[PDB]
Amino acid sequence: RSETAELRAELVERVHKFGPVFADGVAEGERERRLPDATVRAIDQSQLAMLWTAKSYGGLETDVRTMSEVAKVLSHYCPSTSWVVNNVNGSNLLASKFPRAALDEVFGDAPGAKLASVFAAAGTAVRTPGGYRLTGSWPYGTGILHDDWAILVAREVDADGEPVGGLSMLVPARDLTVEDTWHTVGMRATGSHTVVLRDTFVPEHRVISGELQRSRESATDLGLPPLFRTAAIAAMAVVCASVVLGAGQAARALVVEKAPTRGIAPSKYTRQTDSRTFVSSLGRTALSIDAAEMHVARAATALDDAAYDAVALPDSELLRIRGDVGQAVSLVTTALDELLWAHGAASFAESNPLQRYWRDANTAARHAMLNVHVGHELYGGSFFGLDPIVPSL
Amino acid sequence: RSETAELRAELVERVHKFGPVFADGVAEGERERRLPDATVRAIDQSQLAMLWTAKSYGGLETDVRTMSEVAKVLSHYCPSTSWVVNNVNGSNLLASKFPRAALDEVFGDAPGAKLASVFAAAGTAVRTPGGYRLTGSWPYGTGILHDDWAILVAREVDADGEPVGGLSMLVPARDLTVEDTWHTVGMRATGSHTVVLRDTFVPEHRVISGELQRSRESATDLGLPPLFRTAAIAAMAVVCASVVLGAGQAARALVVEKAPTRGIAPSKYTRQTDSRTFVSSLGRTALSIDAAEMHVARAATALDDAAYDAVALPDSELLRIRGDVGQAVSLVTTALDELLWAHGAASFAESNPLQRYWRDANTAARHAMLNVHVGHELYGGSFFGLDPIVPSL
Amino acid sequence: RSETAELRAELVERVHKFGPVFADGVAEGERERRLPDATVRAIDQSQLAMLWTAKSYGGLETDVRTMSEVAKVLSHYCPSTSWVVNNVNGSNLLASKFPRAALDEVFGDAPGAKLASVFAAAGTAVRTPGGYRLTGSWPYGTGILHDDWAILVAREVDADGEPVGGLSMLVPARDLTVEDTWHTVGMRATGSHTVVLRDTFVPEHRVISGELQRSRESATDLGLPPLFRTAAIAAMAVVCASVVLGAGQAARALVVEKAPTRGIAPSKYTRQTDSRTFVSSLGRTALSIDAAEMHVARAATALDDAAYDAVALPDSELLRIRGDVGQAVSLVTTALDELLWAHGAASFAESNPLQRYWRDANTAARHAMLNVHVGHELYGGSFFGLDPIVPSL
Amino acid sequence: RSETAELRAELVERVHKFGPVFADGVAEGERERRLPDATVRAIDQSQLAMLWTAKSYGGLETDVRTMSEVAKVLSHYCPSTSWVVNNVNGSNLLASKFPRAALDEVFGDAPGAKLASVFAAAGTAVRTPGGYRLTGSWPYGTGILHDDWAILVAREVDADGEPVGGLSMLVPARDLTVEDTWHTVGMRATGSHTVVLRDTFVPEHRVISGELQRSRESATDLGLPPLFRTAAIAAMAVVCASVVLGAGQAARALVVEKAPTRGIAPSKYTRQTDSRTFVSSLGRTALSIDAAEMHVARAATALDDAAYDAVALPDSELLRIRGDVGQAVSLVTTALDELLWAHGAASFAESNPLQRYWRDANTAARHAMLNVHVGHELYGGSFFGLDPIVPSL
């Protein structure tokens, strides 16, 4: 309790320590659509990619709340860095569904091993002696250029080519080839490129069923540490939402910081703080961001409490969490629009971080697992026990 | 910790135990604009007016969170009862600013003593030998008909009639006269009538300065129990917001309960749950109510944590709480409008509780301490250290 | 053009002339759940129930825009009166789908004949020699107590009781029996009671198919006057939306009128107009009502233009109109909530017209033809040519 | 009437004719932050910069509604082009406040003369023999690189340097020097650079008082054509709002166009049109854009009607128009956020026009004359006759 809360405070302070390095690489990351080498070095030095790595492999092995709070503070310095770091942690946590052989191969001699993952089934696999032969093209591979391994979801087929089942497959960087497809107006430095494979061999021990990848059987396993009892897919959505939330909070802080030194054109208000319309409006916008913060924290706490108690979360609670994260990022994007209205035309200058937070948050917000409309339907459906409209929870 | 959480669960169960009595008196309360005798008996039997009464006087002496959770559940059975109960508790807590002589006179032989309070300075007082002579007319006296005492704010004047200062004055039912002025379309049974006084004597020991009434000096007093270190005015706003919130939650529960047994006219959807537009919309509306719940809980927790730690809350935190409560009730009134759209034309039948929750929540929401626009300006102003636009925090 | 615009100005002035009578009967209508005799006399004297009656029967024979503007002004004096008047006009227009024999029987010696109509198929009819035998129970019969005839939709069945088709059936007051079922918290004076029939004879000439009742074949008929080329069902939705809109505008006017003579509790603003937060907020709320006004006017103009040109409106335009009216009333209900926040706790006093407009608008807004969620789905579906989710347009 | 409506249809068709050229130059304009030469040639060939130029100088001399409708269609092809074209027309109209000598010098031998204008008083002027000496630095000079003249507002000072009054000053390209300061993430091709002047001579005939620049005395002048009776400053705000609106409409069209060929990740909906949540949500978003369209059209019509009738618009109507335009662009930015949610993660690819419309509309929306918060306060204040918070209407 006090131990896990103490660690959080230390990791938050690490983000502030290494923050200036991440901030310094923003301009280059914006140009190159890739995290600078100094940023990657800082991520490795800070151990911020190791929050959800097992303690037995030299990982920090924290909880959802801790990763969430770290994600929010990271976004102040660089949203792309925050997005990459949290996907790595999420991917590393999702890797714990694989056999020990796979985990030993990944983390055995690499405590700071970083994984990518794209869960869209964009490839086909066939059984071969000793494993599988995999072919596919997986887009939105966040941070793939810096990652050691990749978790790729694929559709198994027989000799005829008829679909038989779903698979989740762990494959190293040496077997990967990356196409340059990430040409966007937000989260540019994340380098979410397309992973390509053509008749790539993947052994049995690094392949699991799609069913086992989305399994929550470990929720009640007292043998495992609390972290690995956590609902992993929901946990990933929560920390991704935290990245977006953090950018929104940084945007709010900037607008507050600059408000006393500028006016509201073309009004008589030479100081934005002299306008009570501006001030009351900012109070409203802030409360929406505060609500988004409480949505993320509630979801994180629910996942942690269930993990520590070693109880399985029912579908209703998991569906609510999907509603929470979509709602939180939705509130942030609306709040960011209001903050642009507050700050003015100078928001859209390249020298101004406000448009940086605005663009990055909006791009990341439309990640599948953060879809607000899907979240509303999932959560609304939980009140009547309707069939979930998504495959995994 | 576990003790205070245990008590809450017991008091929540009392609300369910006595709930049917409150529910049974709804029709009469709606007619008579007054709480039925059976309801008042239940309030006295349940000890629900004694949550913020001192343990030394035989009170329960709970915290803000406990009163809040009790308020929310009470609103399911009768919002007017919930509104009256929470004002009594709030008034009883505000009475702790008076001298021991006053508190002994009120609570000494009456553990279940119930106080009214209206903080609008609607009267004038002059010094007389042994105390003051008070004259005034105080509207919105919630539950005055059932109360033993009343806390009335007044403006002190000299022999000439020139204003000299503010006063808070404790005066018994025997000295009170009540005008029938509560003719409303919501919270009818609350009986928020006008208190009238004409040259009424009030002794020194039952009069304090307006400054002392809004004081937070007791926040650091280790001699006092935690409850009386709590910021009382903010605590009252939080529990009033809980009453409104509870009605909104009861409205949501009803709409969920009835949804599978009705359609959406004039559409092809014979069942409301068959419409995914309805379901996703309900998920959205529910999340707004969930946000309002987290706003109230956050404010309650902040007040409790400060009280237990015996630390004074800074103005910024108090201004944020005023933003929280106004935002929460604002979200509830908007959510109620959405729930009427969900349920349909049958919402407005007198036999339907939905319009009951709708009307009661909306009426109570416009209590001064819950003003959403004031809350936005107070909280927004806290970011720049602007002068608060209200007299007390 | 100038002639039809001239008439509108005269009818708007009639509403102001007879308005005081409608306003005088508000208290009684609220008590009795029925329009006072003086109100019914004024409706008959003013010819306001005859706007959509044919000129050949001594009717005014106006257009949709004129009825809409009259409806909005009527709501200022009495929303229930406005709601009843517009339903009568709408019902009278819908009666033009019946044979000349029926129209002559209704309007032949009664220029000011008033019809009710409920389009929910709540009865069953069987063929009998010379017509049909009808049995059913039709709720929400707006203004039935004052009406001469009623248009009732029913499901035809054979001797076995198997459904064969839909019917629309015109039946006089002499054959009607009314159950007292209208016990509501808004639009009380409308007297929307349940119409009951038990083995009632209805002749051939006063019965048409449900298909013919929702027909728009007359849209291109140059023989008919423009009014009867109008899409009647859509026209009714537009004028019903105008009633709700008018109440919202009256609410806005009241808040503006009272703002300079009251403060914002518990703030330092003794005058509501001194608060720029209040003023800017009121400007926003007003613009939403202005948008709702333009939605209704656009729909009315589209229907009129098509009627005068004698061109048929395509489904896409009809689906858009259903989106317009639902959106307009949705904006008004949200705006009314904002106006209560603006005005304060005094809004909910029975002496205050603001809660009167608030309750009446909200109740009327949930009429099937004004369902905002249905309107959104209908209009959204028109972009892709999806099957409409409602039976008639 | 029919003549002016006929011309509009022809100019709308010109936009479609030259549209492909504007669309072809988008990529280069995005790179260079400047309109390509082919785009400038098309603007000159199409006469789209001459809509508000006088007929006596070979201009088209249209009205506000016509320029507005042209602006909306132009934004479909290139928002930057639309923004530049409408500012030129607006600037050319504002030039009609200058003496005939200035107008003859500008338009005498140049029917297609294009003016810039920045109305922020960013310079100081002193009287010199024959005119003034002007020094200043004017940012946000939209399309300055392609313009022949510039209208610059400045503060007149005496020999001591004490402020004496405001001036509006017409100065040619030959006397201008442009600093490269336009480095933005939206409306990049507009080239809104900083105009710099250092001791530049400006003769008497090309200088007017700030009072005369914002004058509406010509509103009743029957000698002038209707266009030059129009309230010029309000007219400019309306057409700027039309540019933003047009981008929003183009965004809506794209989302509708692409909806049937993509799904909603990670849901079971492989087609976006199969989700009724998506469809109803799109209907709602569309209606907000429709409301924004009616806001702009209402303002344009009010300005035109007053110009043709040669009546002066009162302050209340001008304040309402400022509310209309701010509200319209506010609805569009909110609608664009909803359209990104509808379309998904692919919205933010550089190849996708949706982010192009999103970025351009949001940047242009924060033009001073389009400030939503100022508009709300101006319009709200008009209900009580409060002093306007802006210098000119």
Residue numbers in the entry:
A (entry chain A), B (entry chain A), C (entry chain A), D (entry chain A): 5 to 397
Quote what the paper states about this structure.
In vitro characterization, bioinformatics and structural investigations revealed that XiaF is a new member of the group D FMOs, monooxygenases that receive reduced FAD/FMN from a NAD(P)H-dependent flavin reductase and assemble in a tetrameric ACAD-fold composed of N- and C-terminal helical domains and a central β-sheet domain35. At the heart of the biosynthetic pathway, however, we discovered an unusual cyclization cascade involving the non-canonical terpenoid cyclases XiaE and XiaF22. Here we report the in vitro reconstitution of XiaF and a designated flavoenzyme-reductase, which jointly mediate a cryptic indole hydroxylation step that has been proposed to be a key step in non-canonical terpenoid cyclization. Accordingly, in the terpenoid pathway C-3 hydroxylation of the indole ring of indosespene by C4a-hydroperoxyflavin as the electrophilic oxygenating species yields a reactive intermediate (most likely the 3-hydroxyiminium cation 9, although deprotonation to yield an hydroxyindolenine intermediate is also conceivable) that is prone to nucleophilic attack of the exo-methylene group, resulting in the pentacyclic intermediate 16.
To further characterize the non-canonical terpenoid cyclase and the cryptic hydroxylation reaction, we carried out protein crystallization and modelling experiments. The intermolecular interactions between the individual subunits are solely formed between the C-terminal domains, whereas the N-terminal as well as the central β-sheet domains are directed towards the corners of the tetrahedron. The N-domain spans from Met1-Lys118, the β-sheet from Leu119-Ser213 and the C domain from Gly214-Leu397, which describes the typical architecture of a member of the ACAD superfamily. Cocrystallizations of XiaF with flavin proved to be challenging; initially no FAD bound to crystals could be observed when the oxidized cofactor was used.
